[PDB]
UniProtKB/Swiss-Prot annotation, chain G:
Segment of the intact protein contained: 204 to 250 of 406
Protein source organism: Homo sapiens
Lineage: superkingdom: Eukaryota
Protein's job: Component of the 26S proteasome, a multiprotein complex involved in the ATP-dependent degradation of ubiquitinated proteins. This complex plays a key role in the maintenance of protein homeostasis by removing misfolded or damaged proteins, which could impair cellular functions, and by removing proteins whose functions are no longer required. Therefore, the proteasome participates in numerous cellular processes, including cell cycle progression, apoptosis, or DNA damage repair.
Protein name: 26S proteasome regulatory subunit 8
Family statement drawn from the similarity comment of this UniProt entry: Belongs to the AAA ATPase family.
Curated annotation (Swiss-Prot), chain H:
Protein family: Belongs to the proteasome subunit S10 family.
The protein's assembly and partners: Component of the 19S proteasome regulatory particle complex. The 26S proteasome consists of a 20S core particle (CP) and two 19S regulatory subunits (RP). The regulatory particle is made of a lid composed of 9 subunits including PSMD6, a base containing 6 ATPases and few additional components.
Name of the gene encoding the protein in the UniProt record: PSMD6
Protein's recorded name: 26S proteasome non-ATPase regulatory subunit 6
Domain PCI: 1-166
Residues forming coiled coils: none
Protein species of origin: Homo sapiens (Human)
Function: Component of the 26S proteasome, a multiprotein complex involved in the ATP-dependent degradation of ubiquitinated proteins. This complex plays a key role in the maintenance of protein homeostasis by removing misfolded or damaged proteins, which could impair cellular functions, and by removing proteins whose functions are no longer required. Therefore, the proteasome participates in numerous cellular processes, including cell cycle progression, apoptosis, or DNA damage repair.
Curated annotation (Swiss-Prot), chain J:
Protein known as: 26S proteasome non-ATPase regulatory subunit 13
Family to which this protein belongs: Belongs to the proteasome subunit S11 family.
Chain positions with N6-acetyllysine modification: K16
Superkingdom: Eukaryota
Function: Component of the 26S proteasome, a multiprotein complex involved in the ATP-dependent degradation of ubiquitinated proteins. This complex plays a key role in the maintenance of protein homeostasis by removing misfolded or damaged proteins, which could impair cellular functions, and by removing proteins whose functions are no longer required. Therefore, the proteasome participates in numerous cellular processes, including cell cycle progression, apoptosis, or DNA damage repair.
Assembly: Component of the 19S proteasome regulatory particle complex. The 26S proteasome consists of a 20S core particle (CP) and two 19S regulatory subunits (RP). The regulatory particle is made of a lid composed of 9 subunits including PSMD13, a base containing 6 ATPases and few additional components.
Swiss-Prot record, chain K:
Assembly and oligomerization: Component of the 19S proteasome regulatory particle complex. The 26S proteasome consists of a 20S core particle (CP) and two 19S regulatory subunits (RP). The regulatory particle is made of a lid composed of 9 subunits including PSMD4, a base containing 6 ATPases and few additional components. Within the complex, PSMD4 interacts with subunit PSMD7 through their respective MPN domain. Interacts with TXNL1.
Function field: Component of the 26S proteasome, a multiprotein complex involved in the ATP-dependent degradation of ubiquitinated proteins. This complex plays a key role in the maintenance of protein homeostasis by removing misfolded or damaged proteins, which could impair cellular functions, and by removing proteins whose functions are no longer required. Therefore, the proteasome participates in numerous cellular processes, including cell cycle progression, apoptosis, or DNA damage repair.
Organism domain of life: Eukaryota
Residues annotated with Phosphoserine modification: S69
Modified residues (Phosphothreonine): T102
Name of this protein: 26S proteasome non-ATPase regulatory subunit 14
Residue span relative to the full protein: 156 to 310 of 310
Family membership noted in the UniProt record: Belongs to the peptidase M67A family. PSMD14 subfamily.
Tissue: Widely expressed. Highest levels in heart and skeletal muscle.
Cysteine disulfide partners in this protein: none
């Protein structure tokens, strides 16, 4: 029984592996939060200029006026098709090569405030009288 | 009610009229502990139902 | 004058690099260089500095040579690089100050109207700061010590620089409140308990040792005056400090209690957060 | 082979305990890194910031804003800032090099 | 997990403690207490 | 032998098992005259009753706690718990509690003879037999809370002692243990019974109101234990 | 506007745009273009 | 709860259950003073516009309601005895007649004691009934109940004061909530811990 | 009158104030009209306790003593090295 | 000369110290206190000093108080207690 | 921000600009890669890797002069503490009392569909560190001094 029940005592010590799994999860959890900070290295990259597309031409060329400067012919990125580009569209021009980084919506003048769609008025169809 | 803010100050020879009763710790903890224990009551319901 | 002596980190490293530069010869046993800094205000801040060739001899400490040409030519070229830069003193290693230092100081006094000596140690130890600040002046001691010409200690500080520890601290660093009260208390007990005792022990030894080799146990007013200022607290028996009872003792309980009562509330928040974290989130057999 | 099995199970515990120490040690090292990185996120905000006005949020983690120069830029919003404050144009500090919504 | 084992071995409450305190007392019914002061 | 036999097993996974261990352990102390420790153990045991224990069950645990508190001399009213099954067995104890408050021995005697049955079945009847002498202690404890410096003759009137010297003898018994220092002058002061002073949760109780926090702060162990389970 | 299931645009404002130092065609040409972007749209005018 | 729900003194109409608005007022004054603090009693009953006319009709109700606020201890004790006979005779007020009288006596004893840390029992006798022993016996029983928050003395014949809740009972207040609050976690952890 | 003394007699303080003890309360009412402060005097013991008026928490007393006692110790150490160097100057 | 303990002394000793009658010293101590050359705390229960700041012109003897009589010996005691903090929490120091 | 560059000869352009005998060093060189502005003028030049030269005692003196000097390390006096602490402890606890309402909302909420509940308000560590370090001043009170 001395060498056939002592092995059974080592089976009691097997529960430590369950603790090792719990700590292993924490190691990954800490890795995730630090990885988010590693992702924050992206904030360092300079923002691409915001410009409006006057018109589009073929061969991945678009005519976009810079917001404070002048008309610039730009090379479209692989991500966005020339077809996707349209006149009067606020695209993003790359900081260094003025490339079409992405298409940005909300191309509208102060009239957006007038929409007043947000905060819809209190329901009153029942409250209306005769 | 409101007044000199000193209880029977007739014996002393130095005078002890003062009031200092608003310690934030006693009031904030007393409110939070009642509110926190509400989580304990609610947590018991969430765990017990899944347990059985 | 010389109310404070901030030393820029770049200069602090410069002394060590010179020691390595002359590391081939260990005979000098010290590193000597002209110390250049700006007297913007009473505060003295050392800036970029250069090392004049110098030899210190054990033979009566009178065989000392400072090159006039090196001091003049390098200072002029360095001043061309910085208008603000000016001779403000000199720096030496050799933590025990040599008797020759005062003679070198007189030449230093001639070059700069209010020059200072910084005894930076190339090999750092523990406690305080590496640079030691001494200014040599001639005066008549009020009690009546003859000559009364000696270096006088002045406060010293470390200068401010940017992108300097990227070379060094990036490997380590511990900028957090996590280690506060975990090891910080240990360091103060480590040095105030031992290093503070060591300086007092030097004076207690001096009661006979100052008689034997020291200037005098009964000397330098601050030996007793500063010690008596340190003995603002009585030091023995009744004390009347932590034995105040109705005073400090009663207050210690009120603050300790107010601090302690939060911990019971603190435990409540931490314990329940664990119960939701493991009892419910871990228990998801699905 | 019960005597041999006792040695084998004992070996498994010894290896596991030896490995168990490593996970805790690395996890402690990760905690220090998390604090250092968190300080770096605070550091980008401290440097002098050009003043800017928020204009539109294309999506979470990005924004279109006009600076004092006025030029519109595809800047990236910082994670810590409350999103609700971003929606009113108001005023947003921009990192000088990044132009990001610090 | 019913213990069992030991069987071998306001509306009607809350005021019970207060009632118990003067259940023996209150023979005076308060009015006698006033009369006792009058005799005093 | 059980006290020596006591070992570890603080896991108490059943919890009801811990209450069962506590119920007897409290019973052992109550019979061993350690009433003060027993009442706390019974209260801890009473708290851990997840099972209904509706009839003739939890009432037995309640019965031990009430008798031991009465043995201490502090008076516990039955209104706080009053389980209906506890109530059926409590018609005796409830009258006995009234008898302890009353100065009439004959009322206590009527309760003992009329309600001797059932209490004997509980097995706490021996504790009631010792309680018959304990009635005097309850009055002195009430006096100690009520009067800071009561007169010796007044104590004799309050506890109906036959003689003032008997009252002085009772005052020595009153000091007993776990009560404020009598500090009796033995002359004009009589039963000075001076209460503890400066008990303001200040310096005098600085240990008093910091030690209480240490125990609750020690329960922060729950965060470590549950964190280990995942 | 509450019971609509359509974009509701409120344009009760007067003329600040057009040929004034303000902006061009904002009151009408821009308002319709925004309504085009949201196809189910109702515009309420109070003058 | 009744004193709070008897706030509708202004519009009781002439409910059949009320024998008269006058009866509703007698109940509302009797019920409110037991459950109302001195700030509310002046604001709602002592300064109450509608109640004041109704107490004009009843001299006894007016004296009893006014005496507690006026701190006329001698008059109210006599008036309380008149109230006891009415409360026992009244249906729906007889079951709690004992609780009402003793609770009023506890409230009365707390009011004069609050002002003075040291009170000679002779002074209490002058304020209330003449016999010193009768005030002393009530004082001891109420003190025993935990009511009267004070410590009595003998031979010196001076009644002292008890500790304020804000001063040090704040620690007790945290512990009392804490003991039930902590007890819950001990039982709860075991159920999931198993 | 302030000073650092504690048990100086109030009747003696009235004599120091050069006013009659019998009319001292009215004379000290002049102190009340001056409303300089209430440094504290115990008339029951006939002593002017002119040391501290209204006791606050003594948090600064430990902080200032600790800051000064420690600062004096570094000052002692900084001067100590120079003197130790002077014995070494002859050694 | 005496920090605490012996610093506190009877009025009669101050009467001998001011060479004045003990009844006179009740008046005299106030005059000596008035000079206030050194800021301190003085209790007139026994005219005990136990005061705060004082400036000695020079230390008595060989500064025996400065040796293990008061200073240094206390400092040796502190480092042993500092070691107790290390023993109490060696793992935390890491 | 400092970077080191060496020009590449036009004659050398036909030959491979930088033959590599060691893959790992090229991988370390690859980690910096190229800058977009540098890429614009990259041709006719090759970036060369820069590493800090070995620093030993030099690292040690700045290391000694960092926590002790650049950071606050008086050490003799390194160890507000009891004056404004009561205000800070009350204020953070007040923020927790409002913040804990969001965890109270999560437990009451059925949360069948996962939603953010503003939990992890934390501040428990901040309160723990502040209260414990101030309580450690007891060592100064009876051990560091008398």
């Amino acid at each position: 029984y001395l060498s056939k029940i002592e092995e059974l005592q080592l089976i009691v010590n097997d529960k430590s592996q369950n603790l090792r799994r719990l700590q292993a999860q924490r190691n990954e959890l800490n890795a995730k939060v630090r990885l988010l900070r590693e992702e924050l290295q992206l904030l360092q990259e300079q923002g691409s200029y915001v410009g409006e597309v006057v018109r589009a031409m073929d061969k991945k060329k678009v005519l976009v006026k810079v917001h404070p400067e002048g008309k610039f012919v730009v090379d479209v990125d692989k991500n966005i098709d020339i077809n996707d580009v349209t006149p009067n569209c606020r695209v993003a021009l790359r900081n260094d090569s003025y490339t079409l980084h992405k298409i940005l919506p909300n191309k509208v003048d102060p009239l957006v405030s007038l929409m007043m769609v947000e905060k819809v008025p209190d329901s009153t169809y029942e409250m209306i009288g005769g | 009610d409101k007044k000199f803010h000193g209880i029977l100050d007739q014996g002393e020879g130095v005078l002890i009229i003062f009031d200092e009763p608003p310690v934030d710790k006693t009031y904030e903890a007393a409110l939070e502990t009642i509110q926190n224990m509400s989580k304990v009551v609610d947590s018991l319901y969430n765990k017990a139902k899944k347990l059985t | 004058a010389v109310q404070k002596v901030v030393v820029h980190p770049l200069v602090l490293l410069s002394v060590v690099d010179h020691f390595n530069r002359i590391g081939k010869v260990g005979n000098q046993k010290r590193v000597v260089g002209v110390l250049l800094g700006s007297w913007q205000k009473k505060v003295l801040d050392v800036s970029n500095s250069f090392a004049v060739p110098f030899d210190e001899d054990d033979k009566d400490d009178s065989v000392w040579f400072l090159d006039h040409d090196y001091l003049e030519n390098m200072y002029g070229m360095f001043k061309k690089v910085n208008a603000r830069e000016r001779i403000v003193g000199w720096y030496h290693t050799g933590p025990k100050l040599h008797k020759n230092d005062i003679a070198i100081n007189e030449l230093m006094k001639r070059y700069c109207p209010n020059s200072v000596l910084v005894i930076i140690d190339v090999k750092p130890k523990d406690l305080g700061l590496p640079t030691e600040a001494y200014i040599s002046v001639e005066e008549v001691h009020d009690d009546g010590t003859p000559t009364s010409k000696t270096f006088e200690h002045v406060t010293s500080e470390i200068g401010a620089e940017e992108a300097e520890e990227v070379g060094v601290e990036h490997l380590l660093r511990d900028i957090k409140d996590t280690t506060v009260g975990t090891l910080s208390q240990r360091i103060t007990n480590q040095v105030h308990g031992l290093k503070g005792l060591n300086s007092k022990l030097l004076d207690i030894r001096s009661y006979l040792e100052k008689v034997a080799t020291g200037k005098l146990p009964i000397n330098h007013q601050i030996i007793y005056q500063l010690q008596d200022v340190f003995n603002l607290l009585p030091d023995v028996s009744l004390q009347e400090f932590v034995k105040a009872f109705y005073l400090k003792t009663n207050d210690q309980m009120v603050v300790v209690y107010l601090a302690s009562l939060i911990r019971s509330v603190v435990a409540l928040h931490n314990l329940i957060n664990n119960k939701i974290a493991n009892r419910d989130a871990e228990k998801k057999e699905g | 082979d019960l005597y041999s099995r006792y040695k084998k199970l004992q070996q498994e515990l010894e290896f596991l305990e030896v490995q168990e120490e490593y996970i805790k040690d690395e996890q402690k090292n990760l905690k220090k890194e998390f604090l250092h990185a968190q300080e770096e996120v605070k550091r980008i905000q401290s440097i002098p910031l050009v003043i800017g006005q928020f204009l539109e949020a294309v999506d979470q983690n990005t924004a279109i804003v006009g600076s004092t120069t006025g030029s519109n830029y595809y800047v990236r919003i910082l994670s810590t800032i409350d999103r609700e404050l971003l929606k009113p144009n108001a005023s947003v500090a921009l990192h000088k090099h990044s132009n990001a919504l610090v | 997990m019913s213990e069992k084992k030991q069987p071998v071995d306001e509306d009607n409450w809350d005021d019970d403690n207060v009632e118990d305190d003067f259940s023996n007392q209150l023979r005076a019914e308060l009015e006698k207490h006033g009369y006792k002061m009058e005799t005093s | 032998e059980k006290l020596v036999s006591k070992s570890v097993f603080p896991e108490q996974a059943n919890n009801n098992e811990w209450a069962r261990y506590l119920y007897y352990t409290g019973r052992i102390k109550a019979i061993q005259l350690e009433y003060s420790e027993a009442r706390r153990t019974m209260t801890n045991a009473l708290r851990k009753a997840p099972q209904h224990t509706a009839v003739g069950f939890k009432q037995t645990v309640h019965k031990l706690l009430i008798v031991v508190e009465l043995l201490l001399g502090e008076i516990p009213d039955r209104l706080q718990f009053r389980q209906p099954s506890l109530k059926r067995s409590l018609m005796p104890y409830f009258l006995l509690t009234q008898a302890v408050r009353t100065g009439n021995l004959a009322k206590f005697n009527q309760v003992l003879d009329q309600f001797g049955e059932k209490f004997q079945a509980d097995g706490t009847y021996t504790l009631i037999i010792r309680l018959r002498h304990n009635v005097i202690k309850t009055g002195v404890r009430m006096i100690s809370l009520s009067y800071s410096r009561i007169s010796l003759a007044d104590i004799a009137q309050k506890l109906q002692l036959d003689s003032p010297e008997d009252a002085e003898f009772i005052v020595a018994k009153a000091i007993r243990d776990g009560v404020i220092e009598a500090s009796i002058n033995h002359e004009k002061g009589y039963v000075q019974s001076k209460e503890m002073i400066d008990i303001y949760s200040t310096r005098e109780p600085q240990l008093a109101f910091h030690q209480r926090i240490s125990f609750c702060l020690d329960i922060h162990n729950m965060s470590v234990k549950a964190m280990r389970f995942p | 506007a509450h019971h609509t299931d359509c974009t509701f645009i409120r344009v009760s404002g007067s003329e600040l745009v057009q040929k004034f130092i303000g902006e061009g065609a904002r009151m009408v040409r821009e308002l319709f273009v925004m309504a085009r972007e949201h196809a189910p749209s109702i515009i309420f005018m109070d003058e | 709860q009744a004193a709070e729900l008897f706030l509708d003194t202004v519009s009781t109409f002439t409910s059949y259950e009320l024998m008269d608005y006058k009866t509703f007022v007698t109940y509302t004054v009797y019920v409110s003073m037991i459950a109302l603090e001195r700030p509310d009693l002046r604001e709602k009953v002592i300064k109450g516009a509608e109640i004041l006319e109704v107490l004009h009709s009843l001299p006894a109700v007016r004296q009893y309601l006014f005496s507690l606020y006026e701190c006329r201890y001698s008059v109210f004790f006599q008036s309380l005895a008149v109230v006891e006979q009415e409360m026992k005779k009244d249906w729906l007020f007889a079951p709690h007649y004992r609780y009402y009288v003793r609770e009023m006596r506890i409230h009365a004893y707390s009011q004069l004691l609050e002002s003075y840390r040291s009170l000679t029992l002779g002074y209490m006798a002058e304020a209330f009934g003449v016999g010193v022993e009768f005030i002393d016996q009530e004082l001891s029983r109420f003190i025993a109940a935990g009511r009267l928050h004070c410590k009595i003395d003998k031979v010196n014949e001076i009644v002292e004061t008890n500790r304020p809740d804000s001063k040090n009972w704040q620690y007790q207040e945290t512990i009392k909530k804490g003991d039930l609050l902590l007890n819950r976690v001990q039982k709860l952890s075991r159920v999931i811990n198993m | 009158m302030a000073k650092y003394y504690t048990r100086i007699t109030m009747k003696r303080m009235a004599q120091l104030l050069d006013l009659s003890v019998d009319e001292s309360e009215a004379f000290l009412s002049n102190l009340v009209v001056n409303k300089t402060i209430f440094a504290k005097v115990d008339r029951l013991a006939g002593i002017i306790n002119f040391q501290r008026p209204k006791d606050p928490n003594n948090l600064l007393n430990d902080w200032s003593q600790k800051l000064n006692s420690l600062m004096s110790l570094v000052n002692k150490t900084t001067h100590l090295i120079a003197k130790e160097e002077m014995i070494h100057n002859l050694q | 000369t005496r920090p605490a303990n012996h610093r506190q002394l009877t009025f009669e000793e101050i009467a001998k110290s001011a060479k004045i009658t003990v009844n006179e010293v009740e008046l005299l101590v106030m005059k000596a206190l008035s000079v206030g050359l050194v800021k301190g705390s003085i209790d007139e229960v026994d005219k005990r000093v136990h005061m705060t700041w004082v400036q000695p012109r020079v230390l008595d003897l060989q500064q025996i108080k400065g040796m293990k009589d008061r200073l240094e010996f206390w400092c040796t005691d502190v480092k042993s207690m500092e070691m107790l903090v290390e023993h109490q929490a060696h793992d935390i120091l890491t | 921000v400092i970077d080191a560059f060496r020009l590449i000869n036009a004659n050398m352009m036909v030959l491979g600009h930088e033959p590599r005998q060691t893959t790992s060093n090229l991988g370390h060189l690859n980690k910096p890669s190229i800058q977009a502005l540098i890429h614009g003028l990259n041709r006719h030049y090759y970036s060369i890797t820069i590493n800090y030269r070995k620093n030993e005692l030099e690292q040690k003196m700045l290391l000694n002069l960092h926590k002790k000097s650049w950071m606050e390390g008086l050490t003799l006096q390194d160890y507000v503490v009891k004056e404004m602490l009561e205000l800070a402890k009350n204020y953070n606890k007040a923020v927790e009392e409002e913040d804990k309402m969001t965890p109270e909302q999560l437990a009451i909420k059925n949360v069948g569909k996962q939603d953010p509940k503003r939990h992890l308000e934390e501040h428990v560590d901040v309160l723990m560190t502040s209260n414990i370090v101030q309580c450690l001043a007891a060592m100064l009170d009876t051990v560091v001094f008398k």
